[PDB]
Design an enzyme around this catalytic site. Structure first.
Site, PDB file in Angstrom:
ATOM      1  N   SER A  14       0.839  -1.189   0.000  1.00  0.00           N
ATOM      2  CA  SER A  14       0.000   0.000   0.000  1.00  0.00           C
ATOM      3  C   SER A  14       0.877   1.243   0.000  1.00  0.00           C
ATOM      4  O   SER A  14       1.825   1.339   0.786  1.00  0.00           O
ATOM      5  CB  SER A  14      -0.936   0.010   1.213  1.00  0.00           C
ATOM      6  OG  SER A  14      -1.679   1.213   1.273  1.00  0.00           O
TER       7      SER A  14
ATOM      8  N   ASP B  18      16.409  29.172   9.962  1.00  0.00           N
ATOM      9  CA  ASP B  18      16.873  27.844  10.345  1.00  0.00           C
ATOM     10  C   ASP B  18      15.888  26.773   9.902  1.00  0.00           C
ATOM     11  O   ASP B  18      16.295  25.703   9.437  1.00  0.00           O
ATOM     12  CB  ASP B  18      17.095  27.783  11.856  1.00  0.00           C
ATOM     13  CG  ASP B  18      18.258  28.641  12.308  1.00  0.00           C
ATOM     14  OD1 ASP B  18      18.707  29.498  11.520  1.00  0.00           O
ATOM     15  OD2 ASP B  18      18.722  28.464  13.453  1.00  0.00           O
TER      16      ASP B  18
END
Ligand SMILES: CC(=O)N[C@@H]1[C@@H](O)[C@H](O)[C@@H](CO)O[C@H]1O
Ligand SMILES: CC(=O)N[C@@H]1[C@@H](O)[C@H](O)[C@@H](CO)O[C@H]1O
Ligand SMILES: *[C@@H]1O[C@H](CO)[C@@H](O)[C@H](O)[C@H]1NC(C)=O
Ligand SMILES: *[C@@H]1O[C@H](CO)[C@@H](O)[C@H](O)[C@H]1NC(C)=O
Ligand SMILES: *[C@@H]1O[C@H](CO)[C@@H](O)[C@H](O)[C@H]1NC(C)=O
Ligand SMILES: *[C@@H]1O[C@H](CO)[C@@H](O)[C@H](O)[C@H]1NC(C)=O
Ligand SMILES: *[C@@H]1O[C@H](CO)[C@@H](O)[C@H](O)[C@H]1NC(C)=O
Ligand SMILES: *[C@@H]1O[C@H](CO)[C@@H](O)[C@H](O)[C@H]1NC(C)=O
Ligand SMILES: [Ca+2]
Ligand SMILES: [Ca+2]
Ligand SMILES: [Cl-]
Ligand SMILES: [Zn+2]
Ligand SMILES: [Zn+2]
Ligand SMILES: [Zn+2]
Ligand SMILES: [Zn+2]
Lengths: 695, 695
Positions: free
Chosen positions: B573, B611
């Protein structure tokens, strides 16, 4: 406000009530009561004023005994009549006879089986005690049930050595020589181990992997689990622990070779013979195990609470500790869980009046710690990408009092001085130390083995919910608690460790009647977190790391120089490591000099220096890890494979040098030693270069 | 000032003069002239105004031919008379007959040997061309000298397939079907490959290791080097390249099986037979190689220049490119090296007047790139602990003009939008596009295969000095250059690639007479670096990554659904991957919404968001790397082991699904597929949670 308001907001009565709350019903991991406790802790943490509390759940492999098929050890004659049987459960403590769902003692993750054969006394089941069996006494313990005793090593190491020696099964018992303090009565009228007291605990050797079926990735729902043939660290032989009331019956009939010396003996009234099988007619009798425990994937919940940082909400300072127990967890862990509840209840009280930490605080009630540190490891595997760039420091909060004499702190060298400072401004509960500070009592009772006037701080090892944060991710960590006397008592742990008798009454009447030694541990952990998430500049010192690095380099160099001839044939030189340590010392000195000539009103440069300090610990992390241990990545402080209990720093070089005179190829072994010297020197210089001036 | 002053400070005449300077004497890695060029570039970079220029040297394993024992291929009869000999060197270009230190063409890192045996035509030496040999032809090429042709794959892949098929030796030649543009004359009067032109290049399969003797750690002086038996990626059979004047002589006498089809055929006047051995009487003749190149540890120097950042000196924006050549490097690399020199000079001109970048810029003249990207890889291995926390983005600057038709940009999806903007504000040098922007010409000549009105940006692969920065460390990278027409020309590289005829006169008279297509590439790279180290908010867009992630997931799902039956037996899946992509899309949309409701005058929050953007790329890095490739750690864009040239994203799932219908155990293969789906979904979700609101 400050720490003067946070520390004096903690109460001993609140810790007492939380311990009473958590120590009345069993809370084994993966059970209904543990989930109810997790929900109640989430509700209380929400009520105290936490910003967001969640239940992070993982489907990890746990082990449980069969409630219909009990595990027990028997003595079997020629006709299989089972002339002896061991106890199916410990006698419940008074006031707990009607408490249901008490799991009988069992070694977690033990495979099912019906081993039969002779008994071989193996003492503490260390490599030293297995060398002597065939090197000296010419005893082959393959195919025989190995009976060892708790102490001097981890259980998983004992089982690993038993498998390496070919044993069919392992039996563990608590000798009254290591778990019976002299001049003390048993638990109902004291704190000594009764004869039916049995110590539980896992026998897994995970080496920082975490959940055995998902190494490196969290155990979410969309997860591919390895079947149990390639699982990490699961043993291959059944194991079962017993007390010294049944172990006496097992050992009293032993025969064969006498004990090699006096250390292969205990306090029981048995000859402590080592020889396989029994003596005399009993030689026709053997030992049959009945282990029916099964492993299954069960859901474990970690309570994760958040207190957002006012200035740096992305800077995570974590105070964590586990919540699952074995039966009641009077000391392990609810002595620490009740302290955590008071810490984030005083934090919540400060939050209500409008106080916000400068850096974000993460509180964690972990799960499945008695099964291999599974909850914290899975959570950190799921959140590693945030922890690496955002984890300032970690504080572990396990059992608060394993003793009642003096403090004990195990932290990274970066938080030494901070610890000392926090210990100077506090008080001491000990008699004869009224009006003093915890610094004075801690130093006098536990002086440093090298310095004078400095308290002794041990090394950060493994085996608690800081191993993933420190030895794989590289986050500065710290533990503080109260322990026994290092000299007068001198026994492993405490007698009621991992026992059914580790109840609330034990702590209340024998360990901490006024909950002062709980209050002091709560204060040290709370003020550790407070001046780890509120100080402008991170309270980290690199010169302590430089000093300990020089000391560790000297120790490893002496261990190597124990073999000076081979160090000259293969040109083994430690000059690279010493030069790296010297450059670390110089660069640390210059960085500390810049730390005192830098204006702290500039947010950007402050962030630069704090990031340098935070990633100092990160820089000791080898991306490739240790040999054969990908999840032990700390170059300096990782556990050693050969000992793992008392091993010297630089585990790579120590492991290479261990039993070096026993390997067939000496050139390859010394090449490995040189490679580890090269890796250690490169890592030390790389960590030094992070404190060099930024471009 | 701004880019308006930096871009129009670059001059075409300065690039012309730098190209003339760098392309008059041979600069091969590890030679005296390369070191002299390194010193001169260091001096000039200091004079331009760089803040700190240094020479980082590493002792890495290189390969050189013996100046007394030349390498050549011969046709040997029954009596060993060597009836035919190939050329020992290429005819030097006019004006270069008195230039010394011209290394003859050779395959670097080829083991010494004198193999003999029959010739087997192998075409492009891909996996299919070896599949056909025994699946269809029933031809065993083990013990045979394999002759292949350049193109469609990397040389190392050809040699690896040849070893996997058991060949004794490998011969490479440049077919005039792939390296001879129609209607063009040879190099002295054109830009087509002459008959004596030979292409050089390494045949190493390092998989991102770098220096073969020090995988994972830099090659400093205190380094433990593996001996050459466990070295990484070294071949086991001798290899030698030739032109199509000698390859015609080798191929004209071939016999045996006819070529499969028209694709197994080139432009030479030979039958292109595949069958082992020669035809007729020539069947009594074989091919003997004479390879004498030796490997030795030589010192290579990288010129590292630093321009400090005004606001964020920690943040490193790197503009890098290599300096070593094969003979003269008219295009590869000094077409890029001369552009780098001008970018540094234009930066220094603003530096003199008092301009400082907001983020630190690192300029790099790498070394030993033609030997396996050794210089950049060793430097990044030495500096990984700083790059992982300070490396904002990287810009590769290799050969500037692979052609003269249209631009070509290969970058991470985070830098798509920025590139477009930078391409909109520049000019177009192409004829018929005067007064236009580079956007119009790039879009019209190279339209996107999916969108309309958008230029086509390809994927960041490997093989240049960005592989270590992107596929192991996780730093956003980018490439921009000028290439050929994608459809009308349709041949590999350029005819004079890695040749002695790749001189200055070639560029000056046939490729870039006015150095305008050099100026445009210089401008795009320079402005790529400029608004990459000077913009307040990092110019990164995550929604492009989300869109390409959805597209890649769809492609991998469509590839998997070629086996719908096996996708149902083993319950394969892809719902986890699609859910992870959808969550990434939603979280990226919300983070981009916070990016436009956030005040940029607060340094701390600006640092937080930048960041987040910078570590977005780092979040796709798997700490454990790819299967059997520890140094290929980018989950999305790492090279695939089975193709490595044209492979789809999610390399783990693609390699798991590759040749899945050819494995004996289907359950294990589809379990591996499911495990890679799980890893990819977890990585996508984790990279999404990095843009979730911080705690
Ligand atoms: C180290 C040692 O003693 N190994 C022996 C092994 O050689 C033997 O096959 C086995 C059978 O009892 O017993 C054990
Ligand atoms: C045909 C094939 O795949 N491999 C063969 C191998 O079986 C054989 O032993 C060898 C000797 O000529 O030649 C090759
Ligand atoms: C416990 O043992 C009984 C008796 O053998 C068995 O029927 C039951 O399935 C066991 N429980 C397990 C395996 O969980
Ligand atoms: C031991 O336990 C077994 C299992 O219930 C039982 O059949 C046997 O009689 C017991 N023997 C003794 C001596 O208690
Ligand atoms: C607490 O400390 C006192 C002081 O010596 C000691 O007598 C007592 O046994 C301790 N209680 C314990 C160890 O439970
Ligand atoms: C080159 O070949 C000559 C002749 O065999 C030999 O003497 C010399 O050592 C070789 N050079 C090397 C191996 O560097
Ligand atoms: C080929 O080269 C060898 C080595 O120098 C030489 O002995 C031989 O005569 C040459 N043959 C031809 C046909 O050039
Ligand atoms: C440059 O472009 C023109 C325009 O088509 C072309 O005719 C010429 O061959 C090109 N020069 C090269 C490819 O060297
Ligand atoms: Ca896991
Ligand atoms: Ca290296
Ligand atoms: Cl390039
Ligand atoms: Zn505990
Ligand atoms: Zn415990
Ligand atoms: Zn190049
Ligand atoms: Zn090249």
């Amino acid at each position: 406000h400050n720490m003067k308001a946070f520390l004096d907001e903690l109460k001993a009565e609140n810790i007492k009530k939380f311990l009473y709350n958590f120590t009345q019903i069993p809370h084994l991991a993966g059970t209904e009561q543990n989930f109810q406790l997790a929900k109640q802790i989430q509700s209380q943490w929400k009520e105290f004023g936490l910003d967001s509390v969640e239940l992070a759940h993982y489907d990890v492999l746990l082990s449980y005994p069969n409630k219909t098929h009990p595990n027990y050890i028997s003595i079997i004659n020629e006709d299989g009549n089972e002339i002896f049987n061991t106890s199916l459960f410990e006698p419940p403590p008074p006031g707990y006879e009607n408490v249901s769902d008490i799991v009988p003692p069992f070694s977690a993750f033990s495979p099912q089986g019906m081993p039969e054969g002779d008994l071989v006394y193996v003492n503490y089941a260390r490599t030293e005690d297995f060398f002597k069996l065939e090197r000296d006494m010419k005893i082959n313990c393959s195919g025989k049930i190995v009976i060892a005793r708790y102490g001097k090593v981890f259980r998983g190491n004992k089982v690993k050595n038993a498998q390496l020696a070919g044993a069919k099964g392992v039996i563990l018992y608590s000798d009254p020589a290591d778990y019976f303090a002299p001049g003390v009565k048993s638990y109902p009228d004291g704190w000594n181990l009764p004869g039916g007291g049995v110590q539980r605990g896992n026998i897994l050797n995970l080496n920082g992997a975490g959940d055995p079926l998902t190494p490196g990735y969290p155990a979410n729902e969309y997860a591919y689990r390895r079947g149990i043939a390639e699982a990490v660290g699961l043993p291959s032989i059944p194991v079962h622990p017993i007390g010294y009331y049944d172990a006496q019956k097992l050992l009293e009939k032993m025969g064969g070779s006498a004990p090699p010396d006096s250390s292969w003996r205990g306090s029981l009234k048995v000859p402590y013979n080592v020889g396989p099988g029994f003596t005399g007619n009993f030689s026709t009798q053997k030992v049959k195990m009945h282990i029916h425990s099964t492993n299954e994937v069960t859901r474990i919940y970690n309570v994760i609470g958040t207190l957002r940082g006012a200035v740096e909400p992305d800077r995570y300072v974590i105070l964590g500790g586990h919540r699952d127990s074995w039966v009641f967890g009077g000391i392990d862990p609810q002595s620490g869980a009740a302290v955590v509840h008071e810490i984030v209840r005083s934090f919540g009280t400060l939050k209500k009046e409008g106080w916000r930490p400068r850096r974000t605080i993460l509180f964690a009630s972990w799960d499945a710690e008695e099964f291999g540190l599974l909850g914290s490891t899975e959570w950190a595997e799921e959140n590693s990408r945030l922890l690496q760039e955002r984890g300032v420091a970690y504080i572990n909060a396990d059992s608060s009092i394993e003793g009642n004499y003096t403090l004990r702190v195990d932290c990274t060298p970066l938080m030494y001085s901070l610890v000392h400072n926090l210990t100077k401004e506090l008080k001491s509960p000990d008699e004869g130390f009224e009006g003093k500070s915890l610094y004075e009592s801690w130093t006098k009772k536990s002086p440093s083995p090298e310095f004078s006037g400095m308290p002794r701080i041990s090394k950060l090892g493994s085996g608690n919910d800081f191993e993933v944060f420190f030895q794989r991710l590289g986050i500065a960590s710290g533990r503080a608690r109260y322990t026994k006397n290092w000299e007068t008592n001198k026994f492993s742990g405490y007698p009621l460790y991992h026992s059914v008798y580790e109840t609330y009454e034990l702590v209340e009447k024998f360990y901490d009647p006024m909950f002062k030694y709980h209050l002091t541990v709560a204060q040290v952990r709370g003020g550790m977190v407070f001046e780890l998430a509120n100080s402008i500049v991170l309270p980290f010192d690199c010169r302590d790391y430089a000093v300990v690095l020089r000391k560790y380099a000297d120790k490893i160099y002496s261990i190597s120089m124990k073999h000076p001839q081979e160090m000259k044939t293969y040109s083994v030189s430690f000059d690279s490591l010493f030069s790296a340590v010297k450059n670390f010392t110089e660069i640390a000195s210059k960085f500390s000099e810049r730390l005192q000539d830098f204006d702290k009103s500039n947010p950007i440069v402050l962030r630069m220096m704090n990031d340098q300090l935070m990633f100092l610990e990160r820089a000791f992390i080898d991306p490739l890890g240790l040999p054969d241990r990908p999840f032990y990545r700390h170059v300096i402080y990782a556990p050693s494979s050969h000992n793992k209990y008392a091993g010297e720093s630089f585990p790579g070089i120590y492991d290479a040098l261990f039993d070096i005179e026993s390997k067939v190829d000496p050139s390859k072994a010394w090449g490995e030693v040189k490679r580890q010297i090269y890796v250690a020197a490169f890592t030390v210089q790389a960590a030094a270069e992070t404190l060099s001036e930024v471009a």
